[PDB]
Amino acid sequence: GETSVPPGSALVGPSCVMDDFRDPQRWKECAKQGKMPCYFDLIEENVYLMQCECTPLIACGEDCLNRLLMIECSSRCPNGDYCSNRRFQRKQHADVEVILTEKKGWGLRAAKDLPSNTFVLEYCGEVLDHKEFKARVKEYARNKNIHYYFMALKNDEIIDATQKGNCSRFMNHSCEPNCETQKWTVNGQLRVGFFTTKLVPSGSELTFDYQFQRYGKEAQKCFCGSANCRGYLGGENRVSIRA
């Protein structure tokens, strides 16, 4: 039939908002209604189980010798409080919103235009050794978990955001993504964050190459929708030249 502009609609029962992830009571209420994802423990930093030459005034922009090596400045930066290269320390995350997708579960979207190489969010979680990782892989497989939340930090340390993390756990995989991870040194400790790899317009889902599952043994249908989607996520090997 003939379509028309819908009337204004105001919700009766109040809206669930991003600040509600820092309000356990309201989040648990929202989750019962399917208005927010299943509760998890929101953490501010990972749980474990260098002076640039910038002139004091962008403060520590693209030419900063720390930034170029993916090292954050300290409080002793020549730019002091105005240093722009302390984004993980100051939790200077992008304006993001959590969305419910048709096929992949929840996801993250940009709420403003994000230029290329914008810091989105730190990927926080429990940092596991190989023994704890192997135990939890078996635990989650036995539990028939639908979603995975592991990401390698270093050759002997895997971050697990299944139980504890932040909204970066909702990032979905795309075969043609608009974000990547970068591993930065902050006060001598490696931390990992999501960064855009192109300009991402306001309203766009943020996506990345989920390497942990992509090169894992088992596979699942890929719902990314990309023009050149590889069809499934998982069961792939990186390029090699054999014999």
Ligand SMILES: C[C@@H](O)C[NH2+][C@@H](CC[C@@H]([NH3+])C(=O)O)C[C@H]1O[C@@H](n2cnc3c(N)ncnc32)[C@H](O)[C@@H]1O
């Ligand atoms: C950032 C790191 O923690 C990984 N984040 C989860 C997001 C789960 C979130 N959606 C939810 O609802 O909590 C990855 C899982 O999401 C699924 N997912 C993603 N992108 C898919 C695709 N393109 N096709 C199918 N499933 C896909 C899959 O289960 C993956 O392990």
Ligand SMILES: [Zn+2]
């Ligand atoms: Zn600098």
Ligand SMILES: [Zn+2]
């Ligand atoms: Zn600085």
Ligand SMILES: [Zn+2]
């Ligand atoms: Zn795909």
